[PDB]
Design a protein that fits this description.
homodimer; 399 residues; alpha/beta; Aspartate Aminotransferase, domain 1; Aspartate Aminotransferase, domain 2; seven-stranded mixed beta sheet; four-stranded mixed beta sheet; 14 helices; transferase; PLP dependent enzyme; dimeric; 5-aminolevulinate synthase; EC 2.3.1.37
């Protein structure tokens, strides 16, 4: 057994199949988003970032930067322990209070990331309820799939956004059986929005817990910037709302929000929460300032939706196909894996436009796409450059 | 099934066994470690922190803070993507190069936490080697256990730091199957140091990969501050060295260091790496300044061991028993979850001393203890206050 040679051959497989991926070394320009320096072997050059999940540019928001500077100087670089052992910081406490209020819940629990919040929460909740059946939306994110897998709990997959199929996969279970319905508000690849109320109607008929990942809604929708459930006024119907601090809130971290009992349960039992250093105080302080700002201000969401709407209108006039949807995500459709990569490469090296190809297995074969995430900071000129680039590229594909 | 009542009943179980934990709300005073403000219902009081894993106080190091302030103003609050999609920042690159160099390896891979570096790397490595048997030290950290469990690979546990038991467990195995020995350099709860060279001898004689968690070693031992393998001159013998940026380096994050091939392998396949936002640029810039500092400077490590030896000597002199060991961790043994918790509650309320009980998952039961972590910033006066506090409690509580 040559381990070195073994790992190398696994990678040659990925190279051959065209799925080996190299990172772009970027430096976003704080104060000048969506601009970034792209570090290429032959020296720096500027790009426009078009596939960042920092959806509102809160990454450069002055209130977020100020809170992080002040937290660094008061409390230092890091937490310096787990939440249990010397790593509970006042900013963690204010952030959990703020997240509870955002979602109208009794409590919230902060994790190191969105990924860990789902992995830790789902695996701990299901594994500690013997005979729990998990009902998982087939397009749930990797973090939810891995939490559900790690639970070892019996799991039934229901058809994407289909409450009739959910009902059919709940109908034979005893009401005394623990059940957990795990789904998202906004799904990243197609940008579709879940029928949350219809799903909660089926969940309540069967005494099932509801676990809603609002990663792609929170900060972006609702009167409080709480996400889709906030928008629909049905926050109170979910047992748990999960989210990230890394996307619309523009920093890093994950959380859940729910009853005192459920948050205390995950806090007291979840390995991935207990046995990992707490997020840096400055990370907690930035997220706190980001949430406070997006609860009080609608201006960024309004500008966000205008940029999204303007891009779609211009693509429509230019004849550039994108997948219609009610969210803020603009999946520009390519339909061929090799061509998707060729277009991504040409946008970066000829047009200074940074987008990434999305190919099988992330998305079904024939539905390969460029996932575009317009921000409040993308200008009309940025949109015209991107639309003209895609239009010129599609004409050359044509010829 | 009432979910609320079910959750409360399990929490009432932790209260019954005395292992329900109330978090202390602290603000560490940057520039004034080890002081913290403690927010209680009563209000705000100053305490001395004695169980932080920011072992050298790099959390308040001015070169670390300078780099973090700089990175915020240049790049913003967060990465704004995954490493694959818009979230690779130049600080991540310089940090992975620095970690490779620290451990004398070809490459390094940055994760969001030490916990995730272990869970993701061990799950991915074992998963993707058909018929792999994982041999795990008895006392491996939760993060390593969960990585091993998540792999679904065949697992053998070997007796703590026992290369002869590792030999016996490896001996009965299909000789053609891939094999991975997972262990730590320095174990947190007893502070014992692994016989890395002897474990590596047994791994080599059976064609086994070695995976070494140096979380409580890296930054604190070795000519390069690389940890125990660095100190023993055997970094080259381990297939993977794993560590944290959160403890001696004083920020947050996890990594592995190894060949370009093993790091690229985990980078390309591990869900917990691929599908999670990259660490903030400021975190990467801080961890980078921390490592460059502790590679070039042994003065904090020397002051660290000075404070450790001084506390151990004063504890012995006052008749307060601690678990002797070759590392920097001073475990004061108690006996009982409820007593240990009471001693910990009395140190805060009567003495302004913050030390957490170690309960009945982490350690065995009848073996709850006070884990104390002296840092370079603890003064002779702080040590006298701690030791006289423990002395007074120890007579009252009959542990003298």
């Amino acid at each position: 057994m040559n381990y070195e040679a073994y790992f190398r051959r696994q990678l040659d497989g990925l190279h051959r199949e065209g799925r080996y991926r190299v990172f772009a070394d970027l430096e976003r320009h704080a104060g000048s988003f969506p601009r970034a320096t792209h570090h290429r072997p032959e020296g720096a050059g500027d790009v426009t970032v078009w596939c960042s999940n920092d959806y509102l540019g809160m990454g450069q928001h002055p209130a977020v930067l100020t809170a992080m500077h002040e937290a660094l100087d008061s409390c230092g670089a890091g937490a310096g322990g787990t939440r249990n052992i010397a790593g509970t910081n006042h900013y963690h406490v204010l952030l959990e209070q703020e997240l509870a209020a955002l979602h109208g819940k009794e409590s919230a629990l902060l994790f190191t990331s969105g990924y860990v919040s789902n992995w830790a929460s789902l695996s701990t909740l299901a594994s500690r309820m013997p005979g729990c059946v998990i009902l998982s939306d087939e397009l749930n994110h990797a973090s939810m799939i891995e939490g559900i897998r790690h639970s070892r709990s019996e799991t039934r997959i229901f058809a994407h956004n289909d409450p009739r199929d959910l009902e059919r996969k709940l109908a034979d279970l005893d009401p005394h059986a623990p059940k957990l319905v795990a789904f998202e508000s906004v799904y990243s690849m197609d940008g579709d929005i879940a029928p949350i109320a219809e799903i909660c109607d089926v969940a309540d008929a069967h005494n099932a817990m509801t676990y809603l990942d609002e990663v792609h809604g929170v900060g972006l929708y609702g009167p409080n910037g709480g996400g889709i459930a906030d928008r629909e006024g049905i926050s109170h119907r979910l047992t748990i709302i999960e989210g990230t601090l890394a996307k619309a809130f523009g920093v890093v971290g994950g959380y859940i929000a729910g009853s005192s009992a459920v948050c205390d349960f995950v806090r007291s039992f979840a390995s991935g929460f207990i046995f990992s250093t707490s997020p840096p105080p400055a990370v907690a302080a930035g997220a706190l300032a980001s949430i406070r700002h997006l609860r009080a201000s609608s201006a960024e969401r309004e500008r966000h939706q205008d940029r999204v709407a303007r891009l779609r209108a211009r693509l429509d006039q230019a004849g550039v196909a994108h997948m219609p949807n009610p969210s803020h995500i603009v999946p520009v459709m390519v339909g061929d894996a090799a061509l998707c990569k060729q277009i991504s490469d040409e946008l970066i090296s000829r047009y200074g436009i940074y987008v990434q190809p999305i190919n099988y297995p992330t998305v079904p074969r024939g539905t390969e796409r460029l996932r575009i995430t317009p921000s409040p900071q993308h200008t009309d000129a940025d949109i015209e450059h991107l639309v003209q680039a895609l239009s010129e590229i599609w004409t050359r594909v044509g010829l």
